[PDB]
Every structure is written in structure tokens, then in C-alpha cells.
């Protein structure tokens with residue numbers, strides 16, 4: 373046991389309300405590493421995954437700290453804080469967005485693990501679905517490491533189902549796969565034909581939800597979103613004239629239709645769409661002052 377595991381395992385976990393993890397506007401800038409770990413325990417707990425799958429407290433704690441350690445702190449955007457935020461967006465969409473009741477327990481378990489694990493060992497966009505296969509391999513390696521086996525409570529049939537959902541969810545975070553598959557999702561939604569009871573559409577919806585969470589910095593209150601956009605710029609460049617129009621371009625091409633679609637699946641996800649619209653206005657106004 374390290375010092376960090378001792379302290380995390382012994383801490384009280386504040387409630388979801390106290391931690392503000394149910395809010396689509398959540399920000400981690402003021403949180404220490406230990407506080408993000410406690411937030412992550414609270415997500416597992418309030419989705420009832422600790423109960424329903426009999427996770428030992430110290431095992432969940434070691435797993436969370438192994439995940440965190442296998443992100444690189446030296447990478448400006450694709451690091452533990454991005455993974456932590458993606459998972460918090462998943463938690464908020466499940467709870468405040470009322471997605472929880474559309475999904476099975478095994479799907480929710482797989483979505484939360486995938487959210488936290490989907491960029492593992494990223495070295496920055498400039499450093500040379502190959503990447504997402506590697507993120508999944510890292511995720512599996514951690515799930516199988518001694519003392520980290522948070523899925524040990526599942527039966528082998530549950531285990532196999534969950535692992536395959538995790539893998540598809542992490543593979544879905546490849547934006548090239550999102551662009552190839554979203555047309556079918558938009559098509560089903562515009563024809564009022566979308567139906568989650570169909571396995572094929574369910575898997576499609578889980579893929580889209582992963583992308584919505586992965587991108588969700590774009591939905592945050594403008595001061596937060598501006599700061600996150602700075603991290604992205606740092607990673608893309610360090611490893612400003614045209615940035616506003618590039619942001620508008622990314623919002624239109626990638627984000628707006630996804631959050632509109634998800635609001636059609638669940639009206640309680642509207643704050644994501646609303647936040648993305650408000651950011652597009654701010655960036656456009658700046659783009660017009662070139």
C-alpha cells in the first residue's frame with residue numbers, strides 16, 4: 373500500500389450533492405487529485421455499482437488510483453482530468469439527464485469504466501482505431517491487475533458482456549468512427565424511428581453517448597470552456613488569430629448535431645445542448661472581431 377491509497381481508502385466520501393457531480397456545469401479546476409478520486413467513488417456508489425456488483429472498498433480505491441496513474445500528467449489535455457471530466461459528464465447524463473433508466477446495470481457499469489479509461493496512456497495528439505485499441509488494452513490490463521479487480525463480483529457471463537461493452541465504448545471514442553456511424557443515428561431520430569429496445573440501436577446509442585461525454589468540455593460555462601480550449605491549444609501546438617473560427621468550425625461539424633440528437637432522446641440533457649449553443653455564440657462574436 374502506498375501513502376496515497378491509505379489516505380484515499382480512509383477518507384469519508386461526501387455526497388453527490390456536496391461534490392456537485394450531478395451538475396452539467398461541473399469543473400475540476402479547484403479539486404486536488406484526492407478530491408477527484410473521492411468524486412469517482414461517489415459516482416460508482418450512487419449508480420449503485422458498488423452494491424450491485426459487490427466491490428470491495430480498497431479494491432475500487434486501488435483501481436481508481438491505478439487508472440489515474442496511467443494517464444500522463446505532462447500531456448496538456450489528454451490526461452486524468454479529461455478522463456475524470458468525461459466520467460462526470462456520464463454520471464450527470466445518467467442522473468440529471470435521466471439516461472439511467474433507459475439502460476441496464478451492466479451497461480452503466482461498462483459506460484462508467486469506459487469513460488474513465490478511454491484515453492489511458494495518451495501521449496498527446498502530436499505524439500506518434502489504433503489509439504483506442506491501445507486505450508482498451510491498458511484498461512483491461514488494470515482491470516486484471518492484482519488488487520484492482522473491480523469486476524470480480526460479476527459472474528463470467530456478466531463479465532464477458534461487460535468487457536465487450538467496455539471495448540465498444542472505448543472504440544467509439546475514435547472520432548472517425550463517430551463520423552461514420554452518426555449519420556444512421558441522426559437518420560433514425562429524424563424519422564421518429566429511434567428505439568432502444570433494438571440491440572443494434574442500443575449499441576449505437578451507447579457509442580453516441582460516449583462521444584457526447586468525451587466532447588462535453590464544449591458545453592461548459594464560457595470561463596471553463598475557454599480554459600479547456602487553452603489546454604487543447606497547448607497540446608495541439610506546444611505539444612490565436614484563427615482560433616475562434618476554428619472553435620466555431622469544430623462546434624458545427626462535430627458537436628451541435630450530437631447534443632441536439634441526445635436532447636431528442638432525453639429532454640433532460642438539454643443543458644448540454646444549451647451550453648454548446650452559448651459557447652458557439654461567444655466564439656462566433658470573437659471570430660467576427662478576427
Ligand SMILES: COc1ccc(CNc2nc(N(CCO)CCO)nc3c2ncn3C(C)C)cc1
Nearest residue numbers: 587588589590600601604605608615618619622
Ligand atoms: C491549435 O488550436 C486549436 C484550436 C481549435 C481546435 C478545434 N477545437 C477543438 N476543441 C476541443 N475541445 C473543446 C475546447 O477547445 C475539447 C473537447 O470538446 N477538442 C478538439 C478540438 N479539435 C479537436 N479536438 C479533439 C481533442 C476532440 C483545435 C486546435
Ligand SMILES: [Mg+2]
Nearest residue numbers: 490491545546
Ligand atoms: Mg481518445
Ligand SMILES: [Zn+2]
Nearest residue numbers: 454491545586
Ligand atoms: Zn477523450
